Amino acid sequence: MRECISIHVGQAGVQIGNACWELYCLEHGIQPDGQMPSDKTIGGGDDSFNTFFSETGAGKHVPRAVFVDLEPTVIDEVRTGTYRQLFHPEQLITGKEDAANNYARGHYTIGKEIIDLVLDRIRKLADQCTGLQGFLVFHSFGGGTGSGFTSLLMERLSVDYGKKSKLEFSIYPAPQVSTAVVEPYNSILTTHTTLEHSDCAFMVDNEAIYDICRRNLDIERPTYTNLNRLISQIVSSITASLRFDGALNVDLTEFQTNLVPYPRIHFPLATYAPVISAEKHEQLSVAEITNACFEPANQMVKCDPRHGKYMACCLLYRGDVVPKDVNAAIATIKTKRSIQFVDWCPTGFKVGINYQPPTVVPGGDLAKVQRAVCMLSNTTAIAEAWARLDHKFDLMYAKRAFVHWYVGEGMEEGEFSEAREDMAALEKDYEEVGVD
């Protein structure tokens, strides 16, 4: 058994992390006070769920997580929340004044004064791990802390844990729920400095999650709570192999091996199905949910894979699914869908099935389903998200709009063009792989 440490940075990271660990406890039968009745090995054990939970002598299962935010308001919710008993206070790190949606403020000015404290707390959880695989980092692109401080943390982690893998869960900015105009700046800045330090990053576009909540859950004006519930389901499907017995994606290294042949192109596209309103149902079959994995309306990032190429593809099923039905659905899909792989990669799918059906928070918006699937595909079409982000960056930076806020924090104007040039190179790489 090898442990994983979860790091949640900023409001988006903390709130999403709070929803994920709530889902983890429900899936593993862990009560809010930390007691796990099904865990017969009291105070220890090397079970699959122990990769995410440590055990005390009193039987409490403590998540291997660190919560960091430059403002105390959001983390104070966890301190007095339903699962406040899970985390000891050392895991919750809060500042006083946040990054004010300013990458430079979160990276240089305020991050410099708290970076050592965060690492020391991380070191405490690392000392409890017999073998540490790496870290899972949750953050937003647009926030000052989520962008600026995450990039600083990623650099230090590569220094102190050079042999450990690092995976990202990143929230792509969407104007419908955005809180700052400079989010395109922070997104590109944090991507530039984190690109070499991340082995695999799962981007979630708030626009896609927002529309899925409206379209499929009949939510008129989705809130962060609605968005995070859906996001935690996708995250749970992705990390389920690390927490349950299985043979696919059993460790963080396998994610890079199965999804990332080219290190820079490490942004797999996530597609989830089915999303069913609890207020509403005809249960969908294996073929129907598998076919929905190729509908853009169900993707975490709105893009068209038909006009890109695939480098890898994993199917993660939860519920009543047998391999025979998966293969039959795949055969039909190939005869109706435009699925183009790169010539230097096999045209196939890695399939993982967990018999336990997806867990839903009681009283939530997602209805219980007999079977669900999350598809992780490394498609060049996801570069459309970079193109949108880069265009907005170009519009503002041409006039130097808002640049003085970053320069005032000690950042140099050249870093803007340095980061933009890196994004331009990244866009070029995607076009070479996916376009003839």
Binding site: K96, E97, A100, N101, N102, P175, Q176, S178, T179, A180, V181, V182, P184, E220, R221, K392, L395, M396, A398, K399, R400, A401, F402, H404, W405
Partner: protein, 423 residues
Amino acid sequence: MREIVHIQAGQCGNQIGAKFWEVISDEHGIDPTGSYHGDSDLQLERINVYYNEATGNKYVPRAILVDLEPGTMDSVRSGPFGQIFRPDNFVFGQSGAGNNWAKGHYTEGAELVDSVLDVVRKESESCDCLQGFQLTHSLGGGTGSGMGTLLISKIREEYPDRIMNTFSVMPSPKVSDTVVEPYNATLSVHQLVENTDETYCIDNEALYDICFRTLKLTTPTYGDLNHLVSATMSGVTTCLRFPGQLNADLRKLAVNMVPFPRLHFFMPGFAPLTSQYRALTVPELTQQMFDSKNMMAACDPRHGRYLTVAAIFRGRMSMKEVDEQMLNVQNKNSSYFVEWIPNNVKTAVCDIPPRGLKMSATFIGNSTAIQELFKRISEQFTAMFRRKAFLHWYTGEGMDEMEFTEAESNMNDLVSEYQQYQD
């Protein structure tokens, strides 16, 4: 608790500031004695932003009252909410400023500024996390204009890493006290350009027109004008005084609203403005919110372009419909929003409406059309300065004609800076 320190200076600043504290005290359920008698926890959730808590569960406004004359502050102390202010926070002289910027900034104000800074230091020392300062004042007088900008300069020196915000009343010949107001306003504006992060430009010409043309007040008074300012000030600070996600603090507001450091002068708007029990639909609020007749700067928005816009909706209403209407306004009038700042319009909704209204909307716009306001002041300034008229009032306080020439050039530069971004 991200505290804000409030300062009101001069006759106009204290009269408007007093009404403002009266308005927000009612919203937060604070009586004139400082006791809380509300019925919702949203009122007290961010009460610490503007109020200190004392013994006996009392709430004392974090406000400092400044004037070179005692008359107006004596009225405030004897006013409705006079007893709620901290007695030691009344800092006043006796000489006065004579509607003279030099007296407030150089001679009379200089003698009193240090004692004001002592009160500011005392208030700041007891802050867990100080956001910055907000100042209410007029630019046409001597104390608010002259001593107010001197206070800003010295506050910035002692607190360089804090946000400086002002509600600044712009003089107008329509509602005027002395002919030297263009002189005082021009001198103050340069100070604001350098030493403030956010300035809400409130034009007495616009306030009078709204009272006369819209509210149907044939003989508006200063009290009537201050009614609009109180309501506008309450609306613009709504995101600061109640839980929310957008523009919840001074620095985040500045980051969203100020693409260039010197272009930080905002046009405020309020809706509805009724001369009264009729319910107002969300589409009606949005149209009136963006209507020039509801603006407080007496500038035509169609004469320029919006760099950034902050919208605040208050009351119980369909947030889905609010998003639709806001998107409709931008899409139907996209030509008036600069395309090089994508998604430059941010909308916030607060459940608690203002007193007497089921719902309301507050508009904060950073428009290049504000240059019309500075052009008007510059023309009035030059009309007198070219003949050196009334300069002796200022040269008698030690000022030189060169300082007036520099102020004239600085404001013309500010007008030119707005012009380049409007094309």
